[PDB]
Amino acid sequence: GSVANDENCGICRMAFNGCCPDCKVPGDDCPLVWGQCSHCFHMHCILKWLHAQQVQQHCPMCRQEWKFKE
Ligand SMILES: [Zn+2]
Ligand SMILES: [Zn+2]
Ligand SMILES: [Zn+2]
C-alpha cells in the first residue's frame, strides 16, 4: 503493498533501473523518458502509448498536455 513508490512505472510497473518488459535488451540503448513532472516512463513504452493512440494525448496520468521532458 500500500506504499506510495514512484520508482515504478505505471504502464508496466517496472523499476526505472531495469529493462523494458517486452524488451530483452541487456542495457545499452533502452533508457527511460521523463515528463513535465516527476512522471517518469520508459520511452518506448510511453512513446507507444501516445504514438499508438491519437485520440487522447493528455498524459496517461496527469491531465496536463503530455510533455516529452528531458
Ligand atoms: Zn527497451
Ligand atoms: Zn506527467
Ligand atoms: Zn512504461
Side-chain angles (χ1 to χ4, degrees):
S2 309
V3 185
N5 309 104
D6 296 19
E7 39 163 43
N8 337 70
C9 217
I11 272 155
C12 22
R13 27 282 142 164
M14 146 170 310
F16 299 140
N17 203 293
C19 315
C20 296
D22 307 321
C23 212
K24 193 51 263 266
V25 136
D28 272 18
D29 203 2
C30 278
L32 92 99
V33 79
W34 291 254
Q36 56 228 246
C37 48
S38 290
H39 159 235
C40 23
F41 276 59
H42 319 124
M43 166 130 232
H44 321 130
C45 285
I46 180 70
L47 174 121
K48 240 55 261 236
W49 144 90
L50 153 91
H51 288 33
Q53 270 145 127
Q54 278 63 98
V55 260
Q56 279 77 55
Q57 64 72 232
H58 305 78
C59 239
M61 8 180 341
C62 50
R63 63 198 173 184
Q64 300 300 279
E65 219 150 39
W66 163 223
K67 194 94 267 311
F68 262 111
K69 188 144 274 177
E70 306 90 59

